[model samples]
Target: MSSSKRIAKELSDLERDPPTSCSAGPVGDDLYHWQASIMGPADSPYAGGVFFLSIHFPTDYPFKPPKISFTTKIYHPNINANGNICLDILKDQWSPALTLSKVLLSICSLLTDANPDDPLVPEIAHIYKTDRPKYEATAREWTKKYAV
Candidate 1:
């Protein structure tokens, strides 16, 4: 349906003018399912990591948001070890006008500015809030161990 057209256009746009820190495309022949990766933002503990994600666009996209999850393990207050991210845009705040590029940029921003108060991992949030130095160290270690 129209979802195919939208997805194809979105894919072309991504290919033609990709984001600096992120890239995405169809995982196989399925246009609806995609794989994406983001380079961790510089100056952040996740700086050297390359995090992968799986994105699934529903049959009624634009009207509905795609499902995105980290396939790579990461140590972030907003991102759980299972790779689930807690970002407002991924939930109730989604706007039909927003593109996948915007989503990825927001995610990269999350790496730069983690929201400990609204966290997916409470323990990591605690560490981030109470012991920032330790949080950064553990995040860097996990980045090297799993995401690098």
Candidate 2:
């Protein structure tokens, strides 16, 4: 079978068994595109907020990583202003053994406990490590403005 079709199956399986605080489903009836949302971890800066993320499976998915970017802008150590998430698993570290559900959940978990020490956006991570309250406040504000 084609990669996109295989990836679609992976998503379906994941939807059947969603992890706590994370969700994934088709964007309407469009199978190639999906929408995901994650609730912020209670102990993290993103507490009490829901974050929306967009995932698009490439025609050659599984062989390549899906393109996932946030529909909601967020303030975080690993994400840029444009919602570009920085995760090695999404890039070089990706393995065919990983599923769409696993990748989506990884993104959600990343928000709560970031790998600030190996940040792609260094400045944001710096503030997160140094000025945590300010970081948390900004994250909450963004969540309120973007999430329902």
Candidate 3:
């Protein structure tokens, strides 16, 4: 019922049944602060890359959504230079029913299919929409440079 207990349970679940594209655990000894990684989808431009992230849970447990940010330098329209993510679920759409695995899945999906219409990096979104080949090329380059 407590946040720590719930986090510990979630941590156990993560270790036991990790997502295909995701891996997560505590950064150090603090259960409330975690680090996660999402492998780029095999079919996407980011394939072969591994993006890292940081997740911080609040004291309210499931009642509040965890704060998540990319730690890897990824060329994504929804992810800014400062590693801020512009996902709806991380903001208003988060539900108590969602778990870290689900969040990681969502992030993986974003890596594969970017929502350029609602973007954090306007320039990246513009390139994604107007120059798709260039966008993919740049994404692949960044992935290779930073996520390998």
Candidate 4:
């Protein structure tokens, strides 16, 4: 079977065994583009929020990693308000062993505990690294307003 077919199968499997951390489904009729929602990690800024995202698969499918960006604007070091991300898996560090499920989980985890040291939004990262309380408040506020 083709790689796209494999991805489709795996995506179906995820639906059958949905993770409590989030939800995943296709975006419109395009199997290549996916929509995901992640519940904020407990004891974190994004806790009690449901953050949405858009996951764009490469035309080549599994041969290349999918492009993931937040649809909900939240203040974070790795994810800018514009939704640009700086995750290694979506870039050069991607491995064939990774899957969409894992990617979404990683994103949810990253949101709570941002990689401020290697951030796309330098200012946000600086704030996250400096005053975590303020950063948490901002992140929480965005989550409440944009998410749930």
Candidate 5:
């Protein structure tokens, strides 16, 4: 099937049975471009926040993963100031079976438990590893300032 057709199907599925704490839709007339939001998990330091992100499906989508980046400012080891996320699935580990719903859920999980070992910001990762409380505090503060 065509990429647009596949994207439309995914969009329909999302609207019918949306994932918890996450929402997504086309940016405008372009189906290839989308904007999404992920509500912070209650159990995480980023609680009481809503993070925004942008998504651009490639011409050869599903076969090629969508390009996604955080639009909301966040302080995390796995996510840099530029909103670039260091997630395996978004890169080489991406599979055609993975959908935006699943990806957003994974991002939510990342907020709850950051992977310091594979960090986008080394300084943040260092703090995350050496000073757990500090990391949590900074993350919470950023969430309050930017994502709230």
Candidate 6:
């Protein structure tokens, strides 16, 4: 099947059974370009924030992973000031079976449980490891300032 057909199918599925705390759809006329919103996990420091992301599906799609990055500012060790996220699935661990819904959920999980060992922002990682409360406080502050 064509890549467009696959994208359409994915869109349909997204609309039919949308994942919790996340929503996504095409950005204007470009089916390959999508905008997504992820509600911060209630149990995390980012609670009450709504994060936005841009997703660009390559022509090869499922065979290749979508290019996703945060459009909203967030404070996290695994995510950088430029909104780049350090997620394995978005890189080497990607597989054709993974869908946008699953990926968004994974992002939510990432917020709740960051992998400081492999961080995008080393300073944030250092704070996350050495000063847990300070990290959570800053994350909460950023969530309020930028995401609320």
Q: Please tell me which model should have the higher TM-score, number 1 or number 6.
A: 6
- Give per-residue lDDT, candidate 5, residue 91: 91
Superposed model 2: Cα runs more than 4 Å off? none
lDDT of 2 by residue, 1-148 (tens): 5875796687777768757777778888877798888888888767788888888887777878888988887788888777788888889998778888788778767886788876767877888789988877887888788766
lDDT of 1 by residue, 1-148 (tens): 7898988999999778867778899987999999998888888988878889999998999888899989988888888766778889888998889988888888888899999889688899999999999999998998898787
Ranking by lDDT: 6, 5, 3, 1, 4, 2
Q: By lDDT, who's the top model here?
A: 6
Tell me how many clashing residue pairs each candidate has.
Answer: 0, 0, 0, 0, 0, 0
TM-score, candidate number 4: 0.91
lDDT of 2: 0.80
Model 4: per-residue Cα lDDT over 24-126, one tens digit each:
8887887878898888888788888877888888877677888887888787888877787888888887877888888877787787577977878888888
TM-score of 6: 0.96
Per-residue lDDT of model 6, residues 54-111, tens digit only: 9999999889989998999999999988888889999999998888888888899999
State the RMSD for candidate 3.
1.2
TM-score of structure candidate 1: 0.95
TM-score per candidate, in order? 0.95, 0.87, 0.95, 0.91, 0.96, 0.96
Q: Scored by CA lDDT, what does every candidate get? A: 0.88, 0.80, 0.88, 0.81, 0.90, 0.91
- Clash pairs detected, candidate 4: none
lDDT of 4: 0.81
TM-score of 2: 0.87
lDDT of 3 by residue, 29-100 (tens): 988899988889998999999888999998997789998988999998999988989988887998888988
The collision pairs in model 5 are none
